[PDB]
Amino acid sequence: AERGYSFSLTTFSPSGKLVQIEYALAAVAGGAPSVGIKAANGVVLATEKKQKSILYDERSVHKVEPITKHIGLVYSGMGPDYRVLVHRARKLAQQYYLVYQEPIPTAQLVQRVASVMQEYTQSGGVRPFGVSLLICGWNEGRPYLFQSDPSGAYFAWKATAMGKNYVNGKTFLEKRYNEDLELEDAIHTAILTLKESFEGQMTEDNIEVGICNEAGFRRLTPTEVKDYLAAIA
Amino acid sequence: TQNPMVTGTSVLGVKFEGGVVIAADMLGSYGSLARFRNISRIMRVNNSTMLGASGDYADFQYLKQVLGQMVIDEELLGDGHSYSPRAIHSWLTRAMYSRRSKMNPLWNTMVIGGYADGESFLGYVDMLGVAYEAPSLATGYGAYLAQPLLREVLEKQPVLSQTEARDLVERCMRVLYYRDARSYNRFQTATVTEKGVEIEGPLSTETNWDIAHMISG
Amino acid sequence: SYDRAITVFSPDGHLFQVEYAQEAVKKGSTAVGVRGRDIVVLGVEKKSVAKLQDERTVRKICALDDNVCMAFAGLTADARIVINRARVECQSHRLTVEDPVTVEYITRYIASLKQRYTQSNGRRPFGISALIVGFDFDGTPRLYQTDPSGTYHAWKANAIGRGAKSVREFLEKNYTDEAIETDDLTIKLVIKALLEVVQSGGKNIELAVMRRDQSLKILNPEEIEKYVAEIEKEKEENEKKKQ
Amino acid sequence: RFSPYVFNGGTILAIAGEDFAIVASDTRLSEGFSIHTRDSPKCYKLTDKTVIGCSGFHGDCLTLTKIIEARLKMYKHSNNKAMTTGAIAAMLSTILYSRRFFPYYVYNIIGGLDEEGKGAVYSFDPVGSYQRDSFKAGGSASAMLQPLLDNQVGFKNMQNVEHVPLSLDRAMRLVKDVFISAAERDVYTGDALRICIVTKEGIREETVSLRKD
Amino acid sequence: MEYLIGIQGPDYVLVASDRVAASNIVQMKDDHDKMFKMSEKILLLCVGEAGDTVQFAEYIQKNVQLYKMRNGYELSPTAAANFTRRNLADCLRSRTPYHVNLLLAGYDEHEGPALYYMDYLAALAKAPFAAHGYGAFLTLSILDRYYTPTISRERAVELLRKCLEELQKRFILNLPTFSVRIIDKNGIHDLDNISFPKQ
Amino acid sequence: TTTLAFKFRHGVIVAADSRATAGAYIASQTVKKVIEINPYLLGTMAGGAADCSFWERLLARQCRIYELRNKERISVAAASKLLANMVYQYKGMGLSMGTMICGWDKRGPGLYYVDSEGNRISGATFSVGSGSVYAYGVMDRGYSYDLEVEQAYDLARRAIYQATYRDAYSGGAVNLYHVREDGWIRVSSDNVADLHEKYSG
Amino acid sequence: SRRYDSRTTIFSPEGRLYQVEYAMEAIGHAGTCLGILANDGVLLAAERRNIHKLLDEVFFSEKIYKLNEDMACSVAGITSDANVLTNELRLIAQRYLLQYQEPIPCEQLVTALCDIKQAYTQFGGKRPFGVSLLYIGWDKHYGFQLYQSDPSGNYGGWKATCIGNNSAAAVSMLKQDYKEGEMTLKSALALAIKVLNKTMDVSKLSAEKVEIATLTRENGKTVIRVLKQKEVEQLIKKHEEEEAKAEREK
Amino acid sequence: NQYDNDVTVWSPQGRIHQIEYAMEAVKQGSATVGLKSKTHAVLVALKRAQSELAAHQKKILHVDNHIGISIAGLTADARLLCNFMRQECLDSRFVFDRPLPVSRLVSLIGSKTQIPTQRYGRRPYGVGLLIAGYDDMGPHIFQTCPSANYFDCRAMSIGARSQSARTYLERHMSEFMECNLNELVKHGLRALRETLPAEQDLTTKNVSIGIVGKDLEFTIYDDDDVSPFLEGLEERPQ
Amino acid sequence: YDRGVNTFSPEGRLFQVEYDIEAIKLGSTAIGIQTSEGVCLAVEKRITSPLMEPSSIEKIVEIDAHIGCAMSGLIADAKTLIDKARVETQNHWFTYNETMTVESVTQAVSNLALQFGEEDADPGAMSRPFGVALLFGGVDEKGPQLFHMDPSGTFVQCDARAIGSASEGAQSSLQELYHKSMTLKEAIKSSLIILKQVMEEKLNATNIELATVQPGQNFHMFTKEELEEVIKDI
Ligand SMILES: [Mg+2]
Ligand SMILES: [Mg+2]
Ligand SMILES: [Mg+2]
Ligand SMILES: [Mg+2]
Ligand SMILES: [Mg+2]
Ligand SMILES: [Mg+2]
Ligand SMILES: [Mg+2]
């Protein structure tokens, strides 16, 4: 027989900080890196899927997940927490569509999921999600790229990174690329910004990438991946 | 139950010196259809009490289920305590009344037969919760065809023997067969005595149709 | 739902959460009240006239019904809640019964609310004391006070909040049949009491009163400087002309 | 469809004298045009000075009876004393009212002694409306028994008569008469007539015989 | 059977109701009042079923008053009508629907005089003049006939006088007296009852 | 049943027959239809016996609590208003109640009529019951707020009697109560048989 | 269970709620934000914190929220916490509009949201929201009004005020340079860039390091707008390109 | 003390202090004794008075015609348990029209009082009980403790200095079964006296007796009613 | 040290209940005496200021015409118990149409005894005991009676009893003066004599409450004058 803790597990310290949230971010800063680029003509998501411990079947699980026909995700942090948020985003995505008959506007999906993440920083008996997400979408012509973290706060980026060396991965992009970048272009400068930390032999199974153009969102196959890898394609 | 489906007709019960006897045909009718011709409408509730049910057989099976668990439960304690005939009859009255009060009755009229402390127990229970004790009981059509005979006998000899009684039951089970259109000349007889509860296999009665040949005359 | 017991007894028989609530009341803007015979008065001290403020949106004085009103001292937010709960009870006492709300009845109601909140799981007590004013329609004019403990009493005059102890010591030495034997002088003793601890300026006060039948009246800073002069100089016709 | 009620007949009568109360009822329990049993009196002892009779739907009389019994036990544990005839009556009223919207089809009559030692009788309708009376009858023979009592026990419609108190002896025969006359016209009344007499000495029972038809 | 009438002028609103409380074949009360005070510039004329009228009326009443105590200022007659409409319409499909028909007469020191009519179904409409009850059938045509958007309160009390006389003539229900009241920039003012010399 | 109450200069008069029927059968003629709520409040019984007794008894309970909590007797309006409220919840469920709540407030004589239909009104005079229409007749022709105490007694007592005459469901004895500022007094209680050998005897 | 509960809604020996005070702390570190009241309008100016050369920012603002049709507000504190209190603010507005069919009186929309925060401090065992808000709007009762709210469930109407970083240096400044009764939306926007230039560790207070919004009447319908990049700088230069002209007087 | 405040916390020794502490509540209560012949169950108890102007505490309570009890420990908990016990009995009569078998009632107290000892925030019942009853299995004397445990006894006593009484009872057990009532009661009164300070003994003011048996429904005796039993005492070992 | 409100001490006593018994010792003192001719209750209001209406302080209240009750301790708490009592007496009268004995009433109130707790509890549930001691004085079928009840939920009858800060002393005096045969007249005198002693302030007719209930007269709260009359014999 189970009861439940009704007091919040996140509380302001005298410094005015919300300790658990910071610590959550620490779990993020310690996770596999992720990069997102808004190519003013689409968006790209890519992360370090370095599992493949020779026994791990890289296939069976993904980190770049489709929310709707036109939305997509990637994270940096605790994998299990992510999965929860993926099921909730996909769900939130449907509750919108049933009511409005129009696919959910990317900004709107972000707001909704962010609200959830915020919920877990005040509700009783729980800890904040140890994860940060990068949502990408094509809603009404313009491409979108967002990031929401443990606190439940979100921002729209032209491009960014999270996880290990996200500090360096950002500065790198802070110059190593800019707007007007076309499709395949933003994809290259993305897999590159990844290698700017990717320790090891970055192959087609060490990474996973998805793109979101104004014609749907999808994950690229090991093929199209092995290609871009050869420093081109 | 709001609409009885498969049902059993009348049930009889009379007490004698050192025991009680109950009779009930083995018919499960579905309207005017003698559908299930071989089902027992009698039950043994522990060693000193037995029960016979008229009405919706499904509900009866239900009561049989709950009462069986109750007896089992009690036996597990082996604390030297066990439901008496009056107790079972009391519980049944509470149960039948409770359900009647929820407007969802168990469609049965029942005869509780028991023996405990050298005394004979015989009790009646409605689906509405009307309950009482008496030397003879007859439900369904039996209340119009059997009870007048049973009383007749008892108003002239209050004390019968297991044999005198079984003789009366057979006579009644015959009258019932002759006049109740939903009876079956294939019944059971349950008896309770210091020895316990005994149920007797498929029985029948000699029937006399010689009046059939008196059309013209 | 949160069931923790917030207010509990201590070794010597104390209810700290209540005593703490009472402390928050202490750190509040003083508030005094005097019971006359034709007009009861109330004034809220340390009104911290930040000027960049806005008088209306913060007057520690409120009306509950058309025959009752109150002043408080303590946690601002709490007061609001309690104020609007008594307001509701006021109208509901008219739907259940037909007659209006009494002087005491409503006060008792507020005390009962506070007391309850010192004995219910999940809740903290209300950090405010209240000076309830009103005339007992078809009777005398009464004055009552309440503290977080949930206890309540009728006062001839009283003060709660910052230095209320002082103003109380004072009030106890100025109340007499004679002292304020007329509405003009009644509203005076309060004016004096408040000032007898109230920061210099007069722009720190916010008095007001209710008539034994008329609506409520929140005095204007004008009628303020006037009654604040009728004594500012009266505090010289015996202190600067006999001293 | 399904009715949760049945009419079992049977009448109940009670009279209160200076120092005694009588409660009588036939003993027949029927249904339809049949007789369930000839031995089913409607009188039951609640305390040493309080008796109740219930008629109507036997299912309800049984349940009601068991509820009253339990509640007296509760009262005893709670106040350390037995319930006075008057309190039992007050209680029965509320018990009947709790089923105001699904009534106990029951007509109860309480017969006993008040705290002052005198006789008392309380009559109730199925939903608890009640009062105290000198005498009252409820049930099928109800309208058969009453009239004779209004005349004999109330000296009504009689000019220049002697308003002598109801001697327990005269009462006991009035009871037997009205029930014997009723047994003649009400198909529900018959078989036997049990009487319960309540006095300072206790409760005494007497069973007179009636037509078995 | 209860009658309600209201005529809106350019600067005021005149309203009236009968004073009979009927039951079976008898008038049980000679001086019954169908009007309820909500604000200083608002009245709620309510008629209908035995308990629903008072219960509902007072409920909307005390809730308007509560609004006064909570914000300091009163609700505009226009805002009250939408309030009362909200509740009545919200109870319509509840377990406790209120079977009442009403008129809401009020004056706004900014919008002017206003008269609202309402269905027990909670349909809300603004109108220059309106009535409820069987009387309405025998008198609404009169108003259509003699009402002018500028009728002065002297005229209005006369137009009302006409409708009231009509009921003494055609209507089969007794209805001897009628409470009358006016509302202008200076609040709710009573008026003498319009009565008829019947024993 | 026939009940009535009117208030004049000397308070409030309340009278009633005492007959209770079950169809056509007279089940009793010793019914106390003037319910002694409190020594300061009176109620009547019309419609359902149990319904009136129970709720008003409940009202008595509520009034007593009120008094203990406010060291003041509850006002007639307040009391009648409690009863109205208690009962309104069940509107539509079959409660049958026709009663008049009478007393003396801080407003003077008080009389309210309350229904299980939801009605609740203050008035000078009221008649309730199957025989009410008859009582109204004689009472209306004879009622004056200025009646003298012994005059008011005769009127009320007469009205109820006349009703017991025409209405088959009204009869027995005629009960009469007088509500004075201090408390109520049980004026008289006379059989109809007697009252007849007087109004014409 | 009793062991892990921090008791976020209890009194301290002092008689204060420590979790409220700590929320404040968080507030006095957030992007500065203030509003001033004129006679033809009312405004809000906040320290745009999401300042960075990579963000794509696609919103009308970053800290300016449209509540009512006659109202808007700004926040200082935890943004997520803020998105929650505003959403609820919009709902309270509409519920009023539905029920009364008229825009909700400004102060009332505030007392509403305040009763909720007040609650989070009296019961529930939950932490209060780490937010303080500035409310500006117009209503047929007090026309233009500016309001401020604390996570304590406390509020007040201000002719002028500030929240956030150095929300002390900002006050006193306005507390003396404010035209109490003689303010124009122009003389208002004046102190705006003046005070923000001060309390804001920024030299030559760029157009991005700020967000401006103004509410005004205009032939019936209320108008709410956030100044465009250019429109901002006009007041940027105007401030300085008048300041050097202020030292030629000393 | 990390293992002393919650009944849901086991100590490193496989004990639950809260339970033990509650047991302490029993020991504090004044002593009471229980014993049965083969036809009677008897409860005997010593009542205490706060001051001399106050009455002595109830220690024996009537549960049902065939059951009564004596208490030791928190009074409020005794009333809770007593009422549960009373209710359970009323139900038995209602449904089965027969008295609730004493042993079955005891099993219910056992189950009921066990629950709170296993849930966070709950506390053990703080009362012991001696139960005297008579069912179709004869007389019975049961004991129930703050720990949901219960015992079927030949004789027993709980409370302050009840160790003496136990000792006295253990010595004359063999005698009990064949005692006639008055003798059985004496053994009880005698055992109780064992728990007192030598310079004082049984008064008609501090003794209470409860008797139930094949021939009598549970009955309580408290003041003058206790005399008949106190007469014919015993020297009282000096 | 933080534990549940329902924790036992090694001594087998609930901390909270013990800690409130303590709170009573901080209340004003009240005395109740029981005579064959009636019962009386007296308590020191313990006024803390001239500006406070001595009348707006009732430590003695009516439960019902035949029952009065005096309190001490956290008076705010007693409000609740007092109401439950009045309500109880009426439920009994409603149901049984007869008055409730003084013992049953006291008992009814005592069942709210240890009705406090956290987990596994309703929302409108007490979180701590009531820091109150009570004295129920009244007359019923068993004659005049006085009962005492503290927070443990325990209650008993007393010929005379005292509660409050001066309780220990007061009770000593009561033991010296009580007579199984004294009178309601003698009783009231003793009460005031003793109350006068223990009070820190000089016994005024405006700083004490006295009330009686006798086999004939229904509960009576002594007037300002009737006090003068008895105080006259200091
Ligand atoms: Mg990752
Ligand atoms: Mg059916
Ligand atoms: Mg301000
Ligand atoms: Mg004071
Ligand atoms: Mg029988
Ligand atoms: Mg609307
Ligand atoms: Mg509604």
PDB file of N, CA, C and O in Angstrom, chain C residues 2 17 20 23-24 27 51-54 56-57 76 78 80 122 124-126, chain G residues 5 10-12 14-15 107 114-115 118 121-123 147 153-154 157-159 180:
ATOM      1  N   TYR C   2      -1.832  17.593   1.318  1.00  0.00           N
ATOM      2  CA  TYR C   2      -0.807  17.733   2.355  1.00  0.00           C
ATOM      3  C   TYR C   2      -1.430  17.658   3.753  1.00  0.00           C
ATOM      4  O   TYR C   2      -2.160  18.562   4.163  1.00  0.00           O
ATOM      5  N   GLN C  17       3.734  28.002  16.199  1.00  0.00           N
ATOM      6  CA  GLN C  17       3.221  28.532  14.938  1.00  0.00           C
ATOM      7  C   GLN C  17       2.212  29.650  15.175  1.00  0.00           C
ATOM      8  O   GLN C  17       1.998  30.499  14.314  1.00  0.00           O
ATOM      9  N   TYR C  20       4.334  32.575  16.585  1.00  0.00           N
ATOM     10  CA  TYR C  20       5.090  33.162  15.484  1.00  0.00           C
ATOM     11  C   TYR C  20       4.153  34.046  14.670  1.00  0.00           C
ATOM     12  O   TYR C  20       4.532  35.128  14.224  1.00  0.00           O
ATOM     13  N   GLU C  23       3.825  37.130  16.144  1.00  0.00           N
ATOM     14  CA  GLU C  23       5.007  37.962  15.950  1.00  0.00           C
ATOM     15  C   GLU C  23       4.861  38.758  14.661  1.00  0.00           C
ATOM     16  O   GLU C  23       5.189  39.937  14.625  1.00  0.00           O
ATOM     17  N   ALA C  24       4.370  38.119  13.604  1.00  0.00           N
ATOM     18  CA  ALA C  24       4.186  38.801  12.329  1.00  0.00           C
ATOM     19  C   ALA C  24       3.207  39.961  12.511  1.00  0.00           C
ATOM     20  O   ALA C  24       3.321  40.993  11.854  1.00  0.00           O
ATOM     21  N   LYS C  27       5.130  42.928  13.826  1.00  0.00           N
ATOM     22  CA  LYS C  27       5.879  43.644  12.796  1.00  0.00           C
ATOM     23  C   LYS C  27       4.969  44.386  11.820  1.00  0.00           C
ATOM     24  O   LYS C  27       5.412  44.768  10.739  1.00  0.00           O
ATOM     25  N   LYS C  51       4.618  57.861  -1.341  1.00  0.00           N
ATOM     26  CA  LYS C  51       4.159  58.824  -2.343  1.00  0.00           C
ATOM     27  C   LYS C  51       4.080  58.283  -3.763  1.00  0.00           C
ATOM     28  O   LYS C  51       3.115  58.557  -4.473  1.00  0.00           O
ATOM     29  N   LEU C  52       5.092  57.529  -4.184  1.00  0.00           N
ATOM     30  CA  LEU C  52       5.087  56.936  -5.515  1.00  0.00           C
ATOM     31  C   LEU C  52       4.012  55.843  -5.504  1.00  0.00           C
ATOM     32  O   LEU C  52       3.707  55.240  -6.536  1.00  0.00           O
ATOM     33  N   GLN C  53       3.440  55.614  -4.319  1.00  0.00           N
ATOM     34  CA  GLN C  53       2.396  54.612  -4.106  1.00  0.00           C
ATOM     35  C   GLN C  53       1.054  55.038  -4.696  1.00  0.00           C
ATOM     36  O   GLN C  53       1.004  55.682  -5.747  1.00  0.00           O
ATOM     37  N   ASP C  54      -0.028  54.672  -4.010  1.00  0.00           N
ATOM     38  CA  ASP C  54      -1.391  54.985  -4.446  1.00  0.00           C
ATOM     39  C   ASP C  54      -2.360  54.676  -3.302  1.00  0.00           C
ATOM     40  O   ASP C  54      -2.875  53.566  -3.206  1.00  0.00           O
ATOM     41  N   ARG C  56      -5.524  54.506  -2.190  1.00  0.00           N
ATOM     42  CA  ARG C  56      -6.594  53.509  -2.314  1.00  0.00           C
ATOM     43  C   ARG C  56      -6.138  52.046  -2.279  1.00  0.00           C
ATOM     44  O   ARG C  56      -6.595  51.263  -1.447  1.00  0.00           O
ATOM     45  N   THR C  57      -5.228  51.683  -3.175  1.00  0.00           N
ATOM     46  CA  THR C  57      -4.753  50.310  -3.265  1.00  0.00           C
ATOM     47  C   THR C  57      -3.886  49.793  -2.121  1.00  0.00           C
ATOM     48  O   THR C  57      -2.880  49.131  -2.376  1.00  0.00           O
ATOM     49  N   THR C  76      -0.071  41.293   5.150  1.00  0.00           N
ATOM     50  CA  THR C  76      -1.034  41.877   4.230  1.00  0.00           C
ATOM     51  C   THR C  76      -1.879  40.840   3.472  1.00  0.00           C
ATOM     52  O   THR C  76      -3.108  40.881   3.531  1.00  0.00           O
ATOM     53  N   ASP C  78      -2.564  37.677   4.016  1.00  0.00           N
ATOM     54  CA  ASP C  78      -3.490  36.923   4.848  1.00  0.00           C
ATOM     55  C   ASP C  78      -4.776  37.711   5.072  1.00  0.00           C
ATOM     56  O   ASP C  78      -5.878  37.207   4.848  1.00  0.00           O
ATOM     57  N   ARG C  80      -6.252  39.910   3.422  1.00  0.00           N
ATOM     58  CA  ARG C  80      -7.107  39.909   2.247  1.00  0.00           C
ATOM     59  C   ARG C  80      -8.019  38.700   2.314  1.00  0.00           C
ATOM     60  O   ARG C  80      -9.246  38.843   2.334  1.00  0.00           O
ATOM     61  N   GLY C 122      -1.861  20.535   7.245  1.00  0.00           N
ATOM     62  CA  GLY C 122      -1.554  21.245   6.014  1.00  0.00           C
ATOM     63  C   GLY C 122      -1.575  22.763   6.022  1.00  0.00           C
ATOM     64  O   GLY C 122      -1.042  23.385   5.102  1.00  0.00           O
ATOM     65  N   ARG C 124      -1.131  26.757   7.883  1.00  0.00           N
ATOM     66  CA  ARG C 124      -0.325  27.652   8.698  1.00  0.00           C
ATOM     67  C   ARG C 124      -1.366  28.613   9.288  1.00  0.00           C
ATOM     68  O   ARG C 124      -2.425  28.799   8.697  1.00  0.00           O
ATOM     69  N   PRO C 125      -1.110  29.203  10.466  1.00  0.00           N
ATOM     70  CA  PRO C 125      -2.141  30.120  10.968  1.00  0.00           C
ATOM     71  C   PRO C 125      -2.138  31.452  10.208  1.00  0.00           C
ATOM     72  O   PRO C 125      -1.225  31.728   9.417  1.00  0.00           O
ATOM     73  N   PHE C 126      -3.167  32.269  10.433  1.00  0.00           N
ATOM     74  CA  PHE C 126      -3.253  33.584   9.791  1.00  0.00           C
ATOM     75  C   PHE C 126      -2.442  34.538  10.643  1.00  0.00           C
ATOM     76  O   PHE C 126      -2.639  34.619  11.858  1.00  0.00           O
TER      77      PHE C 126
ATOM     78  N   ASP G   5      10.287  16.435   4.288  1.00  0.00           N
ATOM     79  CA  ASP G   5       9.452  17.613   4.060  1.00  0.00           C
ATOM     80  C   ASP G   5      10.153  18.844   4.620  1.00  0.00           C
ATOM     81  O   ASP G   5      10.444  18.901   5.810  1.00  0.00           O
ATOM     82  N   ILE G  10       5.550  27.299   6.542  1.00  0.00           N
ATOM     83  CA  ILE G  10       5.526  27.438   7.991  1.00  0.00           C
ATOM     84  C   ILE G  10       6.080  28.795   8.441  1.00  0.00           C
ATOM     85  O   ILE G  10       6.767  29.468   7.680  1.00  0.00           O
ATOM     86  N   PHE G  11       5.751  29.205   9.664  1.00  0.00           N
ATOM     87  CA  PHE G  11       6.240  30.463  10.217  1.00  0.00           C
ATOM     88  C   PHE G  11       7.618  30.258  10.847  1.00  0.00           C
ATOM     89  O   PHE G  11       7.933  29.171  11.333  1.00  0.00           O
ATOM     90  N   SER G  12       8.445  31.300  10.828  1.00  0.00           N
ATOM     91  CA  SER G  12       9.768  31.221  11.429  1.00  0.00           C
ATOM     92  C   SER G  12       9.651  31.929  12.766  1.00  0.00           C
ATOM     93  O   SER G  12       8.715  32.705  12.983  1.00  0.00           O
ATOM     94  N   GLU G  14      10.838  34.418  13.814  1.00  0.00           N
ATOM     95  CA  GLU G  14      10.669  35.845  13.595  1.00  0.00           C
ATOM     96  C   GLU G  14       9.191  36.126  13.331  1.00  0.00           C
ATOM     97  O   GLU G  14       8.627  37.107  13.824  1.00  0.00           O
ATOM     98  N   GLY G  15       8.571  35.235  12.565  1.00  0.00           N
ATOM     99  CA  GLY G  15       7.174  35.395  12.214  1.00  0.00           C
ATOM    100  C   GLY G  15       7.113  35.718  10.737  1.00  0.00           C
ATOM    101  O   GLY G  15       6.262  36.473  10.277  1.00  0.00           O
ATOM    102  N   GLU G 107      -7.531  46.103 -11.154  1.00  0.00           N
ATOM    103  CA  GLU G 107      -7.131  45.642  -9.827  1.00  0.00           C
ATOM    104  C   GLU G 107      -7.652  44.236  -9.529  1.00  0.00           C
ATOM    105  O   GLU G 107      -6.938  43.400  -8.965  1.00  0.00           O
ATOM    106  N   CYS G 114      -3.333  37.011  -6.953  1.00  0.00           N
ATOM    107  CA  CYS G 114      -2.658  37.115  -5.670  1.00  0.00           C
ATOM    108  C   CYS G 114      -3.189  36.137  -4.644  1.00  0.00           C
ATOM    109  O   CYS G 114      -2.428  35.613  -3.825  1.00  0.00           O
ATOM    110  N   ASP G 115      -4.495  35.899  -4.678  1.00  0.00           N
ATOM    111  CA  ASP G 115      -5.095  34.968  -3.743  1.00  0.00           C
ATOM    112  C   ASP G 115      -4.520  33.574  -3.974  1.00  0.00           C
ATOM    113  O   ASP G 115      -4.418  32.769  -3.046  1.00  0.00           O
ATOM    114  N   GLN G 118      -0.898  33.612  -2.536  1.00  0.00           N
ATOM    115  CA  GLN G 118      -1.051  33.697  -1.088  1.00  0.00           C
ATOM    116  C   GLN G 118      -1.301  32.295  -0.538  1.00  0.00           C
ATOM    117  O   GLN G 118      -0.771  31.916   0.512  1.00  0.00           O
ATOM    118  N   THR G 121       1.407  29.769   0.033  1.00  0.00           N
ATOM    119  CA  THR G 121       2.250  30.066   1.183  1.00  0.00           C
ATOM    120  C   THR G 121       1.580  29.703   2.494  1.00  0.00           C
ATOM    121  O   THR G 121       2.226  29.731   3.550  1.00  0.00           O
ATOM    122  N   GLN G 122       0.289  29.384   2.448  1.00  0.00           N
ATOM    123  CA  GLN G 122      -0.414  29.036   3.676  1.00  0.00           C
ATOM    124  C   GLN G 122      -0.675  27.545   3.789  1.00  0.00           C
ATOM    125  O   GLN G 122      -0.777  27.012   4.895  1.00  0.00           O
ATOM    126  N   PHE G 123      -0.789  26.868   2.650  1.00  0.00           N
ATOM    127  CA  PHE G 123      -1.012  25.435   2.676  1.00  0.00           C
ATOM    128  C   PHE G 123      -0.515  24.729   1.431  1.00  0.00           C
ATOM    129  O   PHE G 123      -0.175  25.363   0.443  1.00  0.00           O
ATOM    130  N   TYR G 147       0.338  48.064 -11.569  1.00  0.00           N
ATOM    131  CA  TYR G 147       0.314  47.246 -10.371  1.00  0.00           C
ATOM    132  C   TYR G 147       1.550  46.380 -10.252  1.00  0.00           C
ATOM    133  O   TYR G 147       2.205  46.067 -11.247  1.00  0.00           O
ATOM    134  N   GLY G 153       1.965  36.968  -2.429  1.00  0.00           N
ATOM    135  CA  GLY G 153       0.548  37.122  -2.679  1.00  0.00           C
ATOM    136  C   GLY G 153       0.200  38.546  -2.308  1.00  0.00           C
ATOM    137  O   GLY G 153      -0.926  38.856  -1.939  1.00  0.00           O
ATOM    138  N   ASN G 154       1.197  39.417  -2.402  1.00  0.00           N
ATOM    139  CA  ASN G 154       1.018  40.817  -2.062  1.00  0.00           C
ATOM    140  C   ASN G 154       1.083  41.713  -3.290  1.00  0.00           C
ATOM    141  O   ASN G 154       1.779  41.403  -4.264  1.00  0.00           O
ATOM    142  N   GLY G 157      -0.745  49.329  -6.166  1.00  0.00           N
ATOM    143  CA  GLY G 157      -0.792  50.109  -7.390  1.00  0.00           C
ATOM    144  C   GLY G 157       0.273  51.187  -7.298  1.00  0.00           C
ATOM    145  O   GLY G 157       0.356  51.907  -6.301  1.00  0.00           O
ATOM    146  N   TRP G 158       1.101  51.304  -8.329  1.00  0.00           N
ATOM    147  CA  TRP G 158       2.165  52.297  -8.312  1.00  0.00           C
ATOM    148  C   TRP G 158       2.055  53.311  -9.438  1.00  0.00           C
ATOM    149  O   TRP G 158       1.701  52.964 -10.566  1.00  0.00           O
ATOM    150  N   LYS G 159       2.351  54.570  -9.125  1.00  0.00           N
ATOM    151  CA  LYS G 159       2.326  55.617 -10.137  1.00  0.00           C
ATOM    152  C   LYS G 159       3.609  55.386 -10.921  1.00  0.00           C
ATOM    153  O   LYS G 159       3.731  55.777 -12.087  1.00  0.00           O
ATOM    154  N   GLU G 180       4.697  63.660 -10.322  1.00  0.00           N
ATOM    155  CA  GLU G 180       3.468  63.189  -9.687  1.00  0.00           C
ATOM    156  C   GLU G 180       2.238  64.019 -10.061  1.00  0.00           C
ATOM    157  O   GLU G 180       1.849  64.940  -9.340  1.00  0.00           O
TER     158      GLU G 180
END
